[PDB]
Amino acid sequence: RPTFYRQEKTIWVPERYQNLSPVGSGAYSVCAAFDTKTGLRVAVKKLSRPFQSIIHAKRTYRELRLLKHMKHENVIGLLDVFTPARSLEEDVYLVTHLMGADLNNIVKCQLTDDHVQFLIYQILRGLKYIHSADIIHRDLKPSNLAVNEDCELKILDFGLHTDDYVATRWYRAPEIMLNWMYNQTVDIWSVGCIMAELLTGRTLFPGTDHIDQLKLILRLVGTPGAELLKKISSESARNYIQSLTQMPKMNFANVFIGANPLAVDLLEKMLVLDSDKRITAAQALAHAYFAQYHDPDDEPVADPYDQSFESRDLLIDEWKSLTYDEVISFVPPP
Ligand SMILES: Cc1ccc(-n2nc(C(C)(C)C)cc2NC(=O)NCc2cc(F)ccc2Oc2ccc3c(cnn3CCO)c2)cc1
User: Fold this and answer.
1) Which of 34, 40, 48, 67 for a ligand 1 pocket mutation test, highest count of atoms within 8 Å of Cβ?
2) CATH number of this structure's domain 12-100
3) What is the CATH architecture assignment of 101-301?
4) 37: closest CA among 79, 86, 83?
5) Cα–Cα distance between 29 and 46 in angstroms, integer?
6) Under a CB-based contact definition with an 8 Å cutoff, are residues 296 and 37 in contact?
7) Residues 118 and 293: beta-carbon distance below 8 Å
């Protein structure tokens, strides 16, 4: 209905979006643009080959459904959806509020302890909302976090993985890195890595590989207790852990020198090896380190999310009809 235009290392689309500049030509690409109607700077994601197989058609539908159901200040909020193709029988695009820049190029600059408080509070306030819809992030690296000059923070994901530029394994939880089991606390492990890297300014677990990563993590959190060893669903990995020369639990006070006491304490809470023992997003919000901004009423919980469709593995063709239904019925926010 609106007028579309074309331009190219990929081709792009309505008239309202101008000044297209590239961002990420990842495996599945993205553009940063300016929406003339709202007057905001927007991020425009284009899904390449969304229907070449039912698997990334499932990804397509999953993405749109989720982004539609996502409405949180600290989480990406869908703005527009459109296609130039001329009928339901016929590329697709996603638009969202574009924050200043990710967190990579800002770890290198400026941080005070209160800035870390505000940042990690935004992240945990987003993760409460995410986990209360029974959704797990997994890929919670700094480059998937959006920030602007006002230190506002929006959570995000365009991994767009298996790495073995900031390597992803450095922030992946031990158990999800070795399929030992997992509950949502893997994201909290990532948060611990991130807060530590901010306060200390350097990588916490700069693992060169799976093995080196694991060894670095243990050199801090120590070897597992007799209990946690039971929790492993891998007898080869079990014998390997039991073989590693035991490592005692280091005192985080020794490591996080000159760090806010409450900061070191929360780090103690967010880096428990046992998945069923780490602190939860809400329990961390309740932490005194965030009592400056901690507001239980200003930390809403996402309404239920109907994920029933995952078991519905449909034909190659008909899934685009349901994706089209979810496209046309989109409702922009005033
Ligand atoms: C199979 C599958 C599909 C999707 C997801 N999934 N899950 C999540 C959550 C939050 C729930 C974890 C988010 C997503 N998907 C995206 O976040 N897609 C990016 C995207 C979406 C648009 F609607 C519009 C533009 C987009 O690209 C961007 C977005 C932010 C940007 C830029 C540039 N700057 N910034 C800000 C700072 O960098 C570009 C998971 C699995």
Assistant:
1) 67
2) 3.30.200.20
3) Orthogonal Bundle (1.10)
4) 79
5) 5
6) no
7) yes
Question: What method was applied to determine this entry?
Answer: X-ray
Task: State which ligand 1 atom lies nearest to the alpha carbon of 146.
Answer: 37
CA torsion sign for 123, 129, 130, 132 is positive
Pocket flag, ligand 1, residue 299 (CB < 6 Å) = no
Domain boundaries in the chain?
12-100, 101-301
Closest CA to 270 of 203, 199, 191, 214: 191
- Ligand 1 pocket, residue 263 CB under 6 Å: no
Distance CA 220, CA 175 (A): 16
Q: Give the three-class secondary structure for 173.
A: coil
How far is it, in rounded angstroms, from Cα 59 to Cα 304? 20
Q: Which two tokens stand for residue 302?
A: 């996402």
- Cα separation, 272 vs 274, in Å, equals 6
H helical segments located in 70-173: 104-107, 113-131
Nearest CA to ligand 1 atom 13: 157
Show the beta-strand stretches assigned E in the chain.
17-22, 30-35, 41-47, 78-82, 92-97, 101-102, 145-147, 153-155
Closest to 222 (Cα-Cα) out of 193, 248, 243, 244: 248
Alpha carbon 17 to its chain's center: 26
* Selected catalytic residue, list 157, 164, 212, 274: 157
The answer to whether residue 157 is catalytic is: yes
Resolution in angstrom units = 3.3
Whether 145 is in the pocket of ligand 1, judged by its Cβ within 6 Å, is no
Exposed/middle/buried for residue 275 (C-beta within 10 Å: 0-12, 13-18, 19+): buried
Question: Token pair 């093995």 is at which residue?
Answer: 211
Residue 52: C-alpha distances to residues 8, 280, 317 (Å)? 22, 39, 10
Centre of ligand 1 from the C-alpha of residue 196, in Å: 25
List 153's β-bridge partners, or say none. Answer: 147
Q: Write the single-letter amino acid at 217.
A: I
